[PDB]
Design a protein around this ligand. Structure first.
Ligand SMILES: C=C(CCCC)CCC(=C)CC(=O)O
Length: 149
């Protein structure tokens, strides 16, 4: 709940590179998370480029009894937060598309001044553990390349 505020994306890894390349659905630049402990929800606010245009998107995730979350976005998503504090969030997600095809993703998001070594280590271990190659991780300091007509 004190966890709500201006989160930013650091890295996202994918088993399918096409999903996180420019114009891909999972190239999500976070702006804000809102945690609601009484409802067991997390609201995500982020920008993503699709079909050559940038949109500000909102997705609501709901905590399950087993501790994992579900959310509908570009398919159906089931995810686990593996590490969470006032300054970092490390998570892995399974996305299921309309054809039953699955993509596994890993993510590091932060709300502190810096990215701590401890943050990075958890992210990179998880990414290796899920079989994600280093070339299939995106660095979100890259230009989103939004048009400005
Ligand atoms: C799948 C992603 C990005 C989600 C963008 C909607 C990274 C790994 C996660 C488990 C993220 C998450 O849902 O917190």
């Amino acid at each position: 709940s004190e966890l709500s505020g201006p989160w930013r994306t650091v890295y996202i890894g994918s088993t399918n590179p096409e999903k996180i390349q420019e114009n891909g659905p999972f190239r999500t630049y976070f702006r804000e998370l809102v945690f609601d402990d009484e409802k067991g929800t997390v609201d995500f606010y982020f920008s993503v480029k699709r079909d050559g245009k940038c949109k500000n998107v909102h997705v609501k995730a709901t905590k399950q009894d087993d501790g994992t979350y579900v959310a509908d976005y570009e398919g159906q998503n089931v995810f686990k937060i593996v590490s969470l504090s006032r300054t970092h969030l490390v998570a892995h997600n399974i996305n299921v598309d309309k054809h039953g095809q699955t993509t596994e993703l890993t993510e590091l998001f932060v709300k502190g001044l810096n990215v701590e070594d401890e943050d990075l280590e958890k992210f990179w271990k998880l990414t290796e553990d899920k079989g994600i190659d280093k070339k299939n991780v995106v660095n979100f300091l890259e230009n989103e390349d939004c048009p400005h007509p």
